[PDB]
Amino acid sequence: AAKYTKAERELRVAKPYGQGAMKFYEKTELKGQLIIAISSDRGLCGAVHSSVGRQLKADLAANPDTMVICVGDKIRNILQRLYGNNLAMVCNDFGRRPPVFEDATKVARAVLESGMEFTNGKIVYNAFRSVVSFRTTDI
């Protein structure tokens, strides 16, 4: 609850930051490879990594030839048995620290300097609908 109170306090300001960032892609109305999966090495937080991996499994039944960049070992553990031939890279040692921009730039530099071909893509994350409800969407 202490972590959630701190995280929601910073989410109160970092939500319009994503609204402004997504506004350009909304205005272009561009419709869709690479998949970004957001998770953490800290498990037993509920149905987060299981349902996100389940949505990722639905992507494996929709885009079987799409390389996926994971941030977290739990997504790697679930998805390696099914589609170990379609895993680009998995980030680890993440989750204990709060997410800041430097970690985002580390992932951003990883997408660029790897040189992997991608035209479209999406990011898998758990949206914050309410205190008790979270939705798995894609950006």
């Binding site: 609908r129 309410s130 205190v131 008790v132 409800s133």
Partner: protein, 137 residues
């Protein structure tokens, strides 16, 4: 023994209330986290709250069977969906008093028939709408 030893008017109405309380009991687990809930499930939750508040009764004040039938009938037909659950007991005194004073012909028809006719159902719908409009509008 069950319904074999109760009047036709009470048995006809309490059968519906028993089903609705069972429906409210099944969906009561979804009210704990149901920030977003379906309209049918919200209606079941709202009806069950009115029915639970309906069964409350003060000590040393037993009620006649005609008063019990009328109050349970109003709460089971949806007349209390607009009435707040915190004002049901005050509605129970005032609406029954209006029936006992202004619409005694309804009770005479119920006592003669022993049940509730659809014609009396329409009349009870009208006098409920008139009573709620007269109390507030």
């Amino acid at each position: 023994v069950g319904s074999a030893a109760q009047t036709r008017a009470m048995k006809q109405v309490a059968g519906s209330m028993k089903l609705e309380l069972a429906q409210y009991r099944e969906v009561a687990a979804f009210a704990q986290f149901g920030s977003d809930l379906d309209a049918s499930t919200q209606q079941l939750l709202s009806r069950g709250v009115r029915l639970t508040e309906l069964l409350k009764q003060g000590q040393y004040v037993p009620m006649a069977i005609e008063d019990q039938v009328a109050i349970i009938y109003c709460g089971v037909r949806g007349h209390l969906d607009k009435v707040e659950p915190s004002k049901i007991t005050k509605f129970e005194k005032e609406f029954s008093q209006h029936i006992k004073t202004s619409h005694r012909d309804i009770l005479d028809t119920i006592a003669k028939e022993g049940q509730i006719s659809p014609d009396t159902d329409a009349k009870l719908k009208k006098v409920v709408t008139d009573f709620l409009s007269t109390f507030q509008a």
